[PDB]
């Protein structure tokens, strides 16, 4: 039995129409955030796809201490409040420090637990204690069955509004493969929590569309995607970031595939 | 672009309606071969899906010298000839020894190069010289780029009718993962050879249908599938074989998803 | 050109006598710490092997929020101080939060960056600014060549006193393999930083001794080992902790192997 | 308990002095075979290390039907007979076709089962029926415990004289890692068969010596090595062949490490 996780008036579940958790890598500027959100809002309202805007306010693991890290919490939350006021969008963002959980949860709809920090017990408890909807990013080095333990850890803190997100798994050195069989393993281990597919971070690109179609073909709750007006000038490196102009075409295919797969009766197998 | 490989009146290509290379693991008996072939013929005829019947006549890697391994080539070819005479089906089977290539190619339409023998040069040359269509089984330890080498080796023998078949890739000990991004890589490395997905052997079952849909969602030339009247009573090891009863429903889903994806405008730009 | 990192009067380098970073998983009690530390000092003093006592004061990535996680920093630093006053041992411990770097570096000699937190910039910087020697635990998902980027990051903070520690690499789901060829790669990518082998965490044990000999035969700067008086009763799961009584025989083999290897003239091939 | 496999007056076993199975990739010519064999005989007789000369007579997996692939069986067996007449060496060679097993076994001391063909039941049976000692090359995609099954298959054919050879395991695409823990798994699965390490083919180099030392440090029955008088000019690519001139220094290190490790009493942990 599939669990239903509600994000305002959005219902998230493995057997309901997919939800697009879409945005950009980091809040590069107030202006680019508005432009990116507006483009996604136009595409999703037109196609009738449930939507959650995504963006990070801080980049915790950049290569240098001098690297661009995003605007920081206080400035990022101001930008999120502007997007809520302007477009009425639901928002997802990630948190890296224990003290940020509450202030961020008071503003956004979903808080994301970064893959590298997925087992940091104090952070996971602080996020669950906020009562917000939590998106767990599966570490590339974690078995899909191990997501059951994290769900239990969050649920013991009184919070059951949990979504699970795959971003591929380590395959040799410096390379990633997406295990399409892992989605049902995660569904089974979590007793039905919604599973979503982060296609952008799965691409070790020209193959974003076919990989996204392949993922939705399994029968999942949603798609996590990053885009940018001109990917090559992005402040952070988004080699697999989708050009904003390909969004309409991309989301159109995903609604078509998803609708088709969700219409299939289960096959006695 | 994409190469078109002909199997009589069937056209196999990455941008054409998928071909179902469906059958059973081994020719357990003439009676079961007839039963299985008849079921696939009924389903594929009704839905309008190109079909090639698959079965092995010998199992060359059984665990003991005393293990059941099929009827052998002489009896196996007699069975194949009856299926052709009765149903007019196209046939694919695997060959393990150089001497079998000629006699087998005179009866079937496609000869398959077993994954363990994919780099055995004399066998590759003997198979190529027959002029039959060749199905190359990608070893679970080979990279998708390396398939371009096998294509060149076969083409040096004067035969360009090559289909490539993914069956997953080793992931740790005793486990396989299917790299959905490898299909595009094989297409590129082979200058457009048709790529097919062996779903049943990629299941290191309830996941056969999802995994098959995920593979076809990528946009490929075909699917390789094994079924059995009573899977748990099969003579050899079929961890993942589909009950004959589930065929209609399975094939109906594949055709819908394949037609959908093959109709999408090239999202590229 | 091997770098030499000093820990007080100890010289750590790939071509110097190996240093034993040995202790326990966590500081279970003051009394147990004294016992374990004495066992190691006794053995290393007698055999003439450089020694650094190791133990955690907090287990930040526990199984549950309420299961044992150690004494905490306040009691842990008190226990560490007693060990120094009593034995005059050099000490290594891990830190998980930015605030802990300054108080912990005031007591211990080497601060360890936990593998899961290896790319967290703010923590790396706070540790680097303390001036303490830093042990970098290589994440199970990171390639050996990527250790060079982390060395550059710490050096940008003004600290070049870095040791690299291998604990195995993910191999399929929930399994690890140690790449003995990775030691050479880490040496070249870091421009000669000392490389040490964490044999206890590389074992997912009757094979701890042969694996440790195998690591030292490569020619490396040290070994990281955990032992316990009663491995089966440890508060924290230590399936691979060495029984304390096996220490002298274990270290005796390591010194013999290390000495032999370090005596060989380099064979350029 | 370990099995002892005899090769003439040589005893091969996991707790006996390692045996060097050393030679070249392919019998490039009679004069080079003589040159290489003399070099190994001089070094092993000087150092007192048991020796078996290795060379292939045919390369059955080259990239083209036109590629150089050795002298072939007839001329290769002639060269082996001259090496036995001249130096009195024991010989190991691989066989790739069923018909070759008996003629080759009438000339050499050990026949090797190529890794790619390790599960071809008819070739295994043909080799086993010759009564020759058999070296099983572990496939890069097979787990160590699955070697128990090949041992059983061979013993069922009436031959128990089996040696197991590790050549590393697949790690991602186009890369190999050697699992040093694999050796004791293979010993256990085979009920004590001697296990040897092929360092040459484990190198996906300047690291041949350190990796060889690492494998012998585990405590094994032998080492498999290829060398060449002028490596970058081998007729067949041999990227990891050791220059012949480095043999004495290399074998001198291996004898030292092996003698040390074999002198240690088993540590009770």
Shape of chain A: globular
- In whole angstroms, the N-to-C terminal distance of chain A is 17 Å
Q: Structural class of the helices, strands and pairings of chain A?
A: alpha/beta
CATH superfamily of chain A: Aldolase class I
Please state how the strands of the largest beta sheet of chain A are arranged side by side: 3-4-5-6-7-8-11-12
Largest protein-protein interface: C-D, 39 and 39 residues
Helix run count of chain A: 9
> What fraction strand of chain A?
15-25%
Largest sheet of chain A: 8 strands, parallel, barrel
Number of β-strand runs of chain A: 13
Specify the CATH architecture of chain A: Alpha-Beta Barrel
Question: In angstroms, what is the radius of gyration of chain A?
Answer: 17 Å
Q: SSE order of chain A, as H and E?
A: EEEHEHEHEHEHEEEHEHHEEH
Percentage of residues in helical conformation of chain A: 25-40%
CATH topology of chain A: TIM Barrel
Which CATH class of chain A applies here? Answer: Alpha Beta
Total count of domains of chain A: 1
GO molecular function (chains A, B, C, D): 3-deoxy-8-phosphooctulonate synthase activity
Pathway (chains A, B, C, D): Carbohydrate biosynthesis; 3-deoxy-D-manno-octulosonate biosynthesis; 3-deoxy-D-manno-octulosonate from D-ribulose 5-phosphate: step 2/3; Bacterial outer membrane biogenesis; lipopolysaccharide biosynthesis
Catalytic activity (chains A, B, C, D): D-arabinose 5-phosphate + phosphoenolpyruvate + H2O = 3-deoxy-alpha-D-manno-2-octulosonate-8-phosphate + phosphate
Keywords (chains A, B, C, D): Cytoplasm, Lipopolysaccharide biosynthesis, Transferase
């Amino acid at each position: 039995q599939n669990k239903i996780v509600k994000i305002g008036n959005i219902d998230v579940a493995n057997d309901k129409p997919f939800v697009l958790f879409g945005g950009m890598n980091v809040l590069e500027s107030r202006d680019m955030a508005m432009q990116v959100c507006e483009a996604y809002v136009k595409v999703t309202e037109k196609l009738g796809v449930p939507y959650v805007f995504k963006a990070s306010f801080d980049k915790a693991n950049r290569s240098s201490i001098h690297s661009y890290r995003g605007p920081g919490m206080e400035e990022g939350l101001k930008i999120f409040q502007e997007l809520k006021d302007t477009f009425g969008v639901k928002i997802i963002t990630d948190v890296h420090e224990i003290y940020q959980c509450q202030p961020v949860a008071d503003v956004v709809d979903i808080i994301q637990l970064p893959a590298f920090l997925a087992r940091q017990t104090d952070l996971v408890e602080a996020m669950a204690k906020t009562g917000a909807v939590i998106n767990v990013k599966k570490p590339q080095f974690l078995s899909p069955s191990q997501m059951g333990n994290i769900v239990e850890k969050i649920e013991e803190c009184g919070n059951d509004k949990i979504i699970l997100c795959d971003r591929g798994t380590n395959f040799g050195y410096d390379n990633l493969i997406v295990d399409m069989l892992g989605f049902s393993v995660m569904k089974k281990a979590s007793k039905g929590s919604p599973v979503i597919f982060d296609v952008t971070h799965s691409l070790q690109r020209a193959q974003v569309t076919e990989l996204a179609r392949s993922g939705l073909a399994v029968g999942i709750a949603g798609l996590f995607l990053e885009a940018h007006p001109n990917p090559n000038q992005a402040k952070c490196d988004g080699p697999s970031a989708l050009p904003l102009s390909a969004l309409e075409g991309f989301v159109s295919q995903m609604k078509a595939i998803d609708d088709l797969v969700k219409s299939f009766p289960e096959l006695d197998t």
